[PDB]
DNA sequence: ACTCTGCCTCAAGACGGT
DNA sequence: TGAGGCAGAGT
DNA sequence: ACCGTCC
């Protein structure tokens, strides 16, 4: 994420948000961060504090927001191709040892809630323990192969890869709550793309060429205020906050500019900075090559999908066989039969 | 008065019978 | 892999 | 729409 991002454009950028009718969207394709979502299902859905499992013991949450939600999406006509992270940059590595020291705090303070029987302070540390797997991650892919919906592995960080594919055309928006999609160059971003059958939250599309023209900036030097905001990959300016970033930014035009301009003893800026690598690895960050694998949703495996969610899930055979009839009519509305010439 | 930091707390899904 | 409220302190 | 239940 971005340090502030979202309310800083509310606030100085409102135009760059647009509301559409999910009405509005039947045949547009989008690319979503599974590892993402994956996470969301694995904290929120629950009975009793616990997550949904089979009777052997194994999590079935993920599975079940993934199986359902989609279905949601291809019935309004959206057809989402789901994108996986990959391995984490170097740059990365000081953000992560700070989440394991995280871990190993919340896993102390589970124990001691346990042993106290405060059972609402269990249920939240467990959630600070959620962990999105490997297992989580190859069931999910497995579903979504028998669900006839594609999906990819990029190289790196998902989000950076899922703009690559608005920028390719591929798709047309990265639809992610993670506001970094926006510093990787994604045209657009999509938040709350649920099409969930209860309303809430309104879809928001943020547009980065109107983002860009209200700040004044190019991609360049928008890149250096979200660094100055706070990124994942080093450290901001302390006492620079978002007022008096986008001030440095509009005046100065970049951090090593910014540098040079501001007093060492008023505002230091940190030791070793490491702006220039966050720089580089926003704006040319490893994704996959989006003209390799072409996007295309088949139709559902149907008595496999049974034997997998039913047989082995233990899910509802009633609302999985209704589940798949939905989504392979759904599928026939929205999508051409491939044609040969 | 405007701005920022540190610390707190909270929320986080979908289906279907009614 | 946040967000927003609040008190206190820096500009 | 509410809310008990989903696995
Ligand atoms: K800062
Ligand atoms: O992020
Ligand atoms: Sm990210
Ligand atoms: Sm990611
Ligand atoms: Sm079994
Ligand atoms: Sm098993």
Redesign the pocket.
Known sequence: ???????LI?DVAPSAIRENDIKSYFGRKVAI?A??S????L?????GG??????EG?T??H???MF??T??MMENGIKPVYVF?GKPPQLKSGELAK?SERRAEAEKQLQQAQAAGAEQEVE?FT??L???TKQHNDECKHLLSLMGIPYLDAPS???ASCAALVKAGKVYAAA?????CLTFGSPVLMRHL???????LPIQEFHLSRILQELGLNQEQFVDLCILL?S?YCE????????????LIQKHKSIEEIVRRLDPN??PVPENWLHKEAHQLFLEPEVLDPESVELKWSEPNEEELIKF?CGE????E???R??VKRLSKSRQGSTLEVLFQ
């Not at 992610?176 to 970094?180: A, F, I, K, R, S």
């Open positions: 994420g971005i340090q502030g991002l979202a309310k509310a961060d590892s993402m994956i996470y969301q299902f904290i929120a859905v629950r009975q616990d997550v949904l499992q089979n009777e194994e079935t949450s599975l079940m927001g359902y939600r279905i949601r992270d989440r939240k959630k600070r959620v962990k999105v960080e998902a989000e992610t709550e993670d506001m970094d649920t099409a969930s059958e209860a309303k809430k706070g994942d901001s300016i302390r006492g620079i906050g978002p007022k008096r970033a986008v001030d008023k505002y969610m899930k233990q899910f509802s009633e609302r999985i209704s589940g």
